[PDB]
């Protein structure tokens, strides 16, 4: 067909000084510099192409901009007429070459004007094959998937390995996760094993909480350790093409990322909710005996309801807003690595709420603990002393109890009536020296009390004895033996082994102080519940450190994301306008996340699991597996244990 | 020949109003009352002869005084001359008629004066035969033998049958001696037979004392039972003539009395000396229990020296002073029946001496009973307690064992190492409470000990278990069951069934005290030493009763001997010359020996032998006569090989 008048412009033809345009040979021999507005000569047109060739980086732009640049700077001129490039050739660059309008801006002669670029014209460059493809820079990787391209740079995608941290820092962090993960995995596994080895007896509701607390940290450990199997880490953190996994759940990608996300986050949130249960349980167990509250042993349908539903609602909500992001250095998929606000919302806020609710019950339980001890602070000290040594011991014991918060009433046996003497005291300390040359004779003033000791109200009373004697005599502190014996026959609860002073009690003052310290120590305020309280405050400590680390990351990640963008886009090269002074990359990370804070975070996190596994580190546990061995050997034959077997 | 002038006196002859003198006819018809100084007429002379005829009793005197009294009161007067009695007729009465000079005294005309009774004259009464011999009253008997004559009554002797006791009382006493004698004879014979039946093992010197103690009461029984042989009693208690045997040995009399005396008295004194040996042996043996030291070892020789020589010296001394007296009611010859002082000297005094010496060693032995012993008992109490109930039980058991003399070491199972833990204890008491909801689980602190219980040294150890539990739980004190099952499988000796407390031990304190008491009991002690001590005090009791009875007889026989003399001399009558002055005979016993005291004496004597024969009344004796029948039949514990 003959050429159209509007698909050509009148221009004086000049012979081509260059027989090649951006690596491809030209079929014609005459050109024009009329289409190029910035160029007047072929030498200048060639010079501009060397500046435009800076777009090799971002290849899906480079592939479409090569034909357009050859159709404008080096076009076909034949019989004093230059061919115009079609509108379709110009419009094909607008999209993938957005970076041009974003950085420099399309010049007057390269904007798709119907005057400069007419509709339905033969391009001539359509016949010419441009085999040049381009390449992506070191922090980016070529990806075909459009859902993996990084911002403006179409054709390239952000690599899987986090570019803010070196390979040395990756190896260092993975070694740290392997160490804590394995210890936490093993310790919790031992605790879950001993509980199921005594499952029918260990289901008692005050301690069964520590079983589920360990169960969460056990499942959590599996999520963090999954990355160490051969090749798993890249199946969890890298996409099929090779770019890092962002905004999961995402289409046409394996579940490996969301599976590990659920295991880590759900076990994290189920664990912190079981913490609030532990703090609540210790708090309410006191008022079960003290005032009116009744045992909570049977709230299986209420604690399991809230501990397993709240993490479920949160995990489903994260998958819905699809903010599950993968990370090579942490080796797991978690909520809010790309966008810090989601990590703050679904992690920092729930951990903050469990600290104020859980912290409230620790305060309440302690206030209950201290009010009960003040209601059990009356103590009677009755002493029988001739030369004043037991009197001195009684008075020494009295100040130690008083310094500890008791209301001490010290009385001489010579001035007391036996009838209902011990009525109204939480503790009764009876002191008497030993006399009698051939035998055991009590100090004279204590005989009337000792003979009518049945009328004192010793039955069920918490008592302890003391007394002064001399090893130089036969039957050392025989009176202490006799009083302990009559009190024990009347039904009194002997708190500790009688304090028997040899010689002068002043030269044994700290022994008296030491005994009086231990005698209050033996005054139990639920031994079974006390341990539940240490573990409550212990867990709170580690949860508070975890919250602090997430707060640091929340308060600074806005700057690190900006620093991430500025570094990758600068490393992408693609500097079209002019060439830099040296080929040097001239690119830095102004600020990045702190790996220390993350190690402190994992220490507090995994550390809770290790600390809670020590709940079953008692003598009772040794007997649990003893039964398991003894009656695994006793069950090696037929049937099992019996009444006389 | 013509009659001599000095064999006759001038007197007026008067015809005889009485033709008979003391039962004999007179050849002459004229008499005189000149020779009789107390008589003036024939009626008065006849009257005096009736008073002199009171001497029919004491016939030795009556036979010789009849001719003299007829020659003085009714003499021959012929041609105004009365015949004088010869000196020989008068001198013949002086001796056998001593009673006359002892009671009234010979009158002036009956003393042998050469003036009143000249030498060599025809008596005339020499031709006259006096057939009258006289008599001996009921407690006396006529005896030819001079030695048997009793006191002043020559011609009579005290009968064999004791006149103070009736025939009914003799039969009653002989029946009592026959009963005890036979039982004591049989019982001791069985005991002597059993020691001989197994003489090698029973010849141990703490026990063989009881063999010789029985040997004495056996020989003694033979002496008391010998009287029951047909007519043996009268050969032992009566002399050949028929009078009771007094102050023997006596000439021309059988040994039957001294033979029975030796058998009874020697066996009595050998027995009471063997008692002092028994009291000494227990005293020294019980003292030497804390060591191997054997105290009696060389004393064996010295015991036989003392026990067999002292009775011999005494028996010989009694035969020397010859105070062996026979008695019909006791039926045996013994020392001091006639004279109480010899019975007191040779019986009461030695029995008194054996009581103070023998009593001393019984006291010394009870002093050893309450003295500190060299050997004490060691006991270990290991307890496993969570709420302190088994700890309380352990301490309650401890204080009870300690009150009994044990050295109790009470330890908590939580603070002990199982390795050689029971080493050095006589008794080990393990205590443990039961725990576990579905099964039997021991108190937590006892598990380490229970699992390494093989290393404690329980093999052959005497053990007993205890523990607290609650019936409200399925397996009541299952830990007590498990511990005594493992101890029994290791070879420990379970002393008693485990003390299993239901609920609070404080409300069952005396049950714990009671169990602890019974645990000590099942520990075997020296039953032979114990038993020797009981037989020592048993024998002392009976010896003390025997002494009491001999003391009664000693303190009163002086009166009974006086009563014996007064009654016998009364029954027989003498009356030398008295019109008796209207009297009442009233001849009776004022006081006699008590037969009750004698029965109490024999009961305590024979009773000692019966009590000491019980020494061989044990289960071992049944086995001794078991082996004896088999060994003599030839066969062993089945058939001989
Ligand atoms: C997110 N991020 C980035 O580098 C990052 C990635 C992509 C973009 N972007 O724009 O595409 C931006 C960024 C930036 F701006 F740098 F944040 C860091 C990754 C590493 N790191 C960790 N964070 N949490 C945990 C941890 C503790 C307890 N539980 N968990 C889950 C953790 C555990 C171990 C080791 C490290 C951890 C800190 C944040
Ligand atoms: C002696 N006498 C006379 O009657 C007696 C005889 C003669 C004259 N006299 O003057 O010629 C005086 C008296 C008189 F004065 F009455 F005593 C009694 C005889 C009987 N009797 C006994 N005596 N001992 C024992 C006995 C106990 C333990 N061992 N034995 C040896 C004994 C045992 C059984 C039964 C009786 C016994 C008491 C004394
Ligand atoms: C007569 C006498 C008997 C004594 N008996 C004993 C005794 O059996 N055991 C003992 O340990 N001390 C015994 N002692 C020592 C006293 O117990 C000792 O001096 C004590 O410190 C007195 O204390 P007091 O002032 O309370 O009476 C005895 C002292 C005396 C002088
Ligand atoms: C969990 C439990 C289990 C028990 N099991 C038993 C048992 O099997 N048999 C038994 O007789 N008592 C059983 N008891 C009761 C104790 O044996 C009882 O209270 C005892 O007095 C404890 O004594 P202690 O102070 O020596 O430990 C059990 C008590 C508890 C609380």
Author numbering:
A (entry chain A): 58 to 433, 1002 to 1148, 444 to 565
B (entry chain B): 58 to 433, 1002 to 1148, 444 to 561
Task: Pull verbatim passages from the article behind this deposition.
The smoothened receptor (SMO), a Class Frizzled seven-transmembrane helices (7TM) G protein-coupled receptor (GPCR), is a key component in this signalling pathway. The activity of SMO is suppressed by the PTCH receptor, a 12TM protein. This suppression is disabled when Hh binds to PTCH, leading to phosphorylation of SMO's cytoplasmic region, which induces the translocation of GLI transcription factors into the nucleus to activate target genes.
We determined the structure using room temperature data collected at an X-ray free-electron laser (XFEL) source at 2.9 Å resolution. Since the room temperature XFEL crystal structure potentially represents a closer-to-native receptor conformation and at a slightly higher resolution than the synchrotron structure obtained at cryo-cooled conditions, we describe the XFEL SMO structure below, unless noted otherwise. One of these ligands, TC114, with the 4-nitro group substitution, was predicted to form an electrostatic interaction with the protonated ɛ-amine of K395. Analysis of our multi-domain SMO structures indicated that the nitro group introduced in the TC114 ligand does interact strongly with K395 in SMO as designed, and enhance the π–π stacking between the benzoyl group and F484 on helix VI. Therefore, we conclude that TC114 stabilizes the multi-domain SMO by keeping helix VI in a stable conformation that in turn enhances the hydrophobic interaction between the extended ECL3 and the CRD hydrophobic groove.
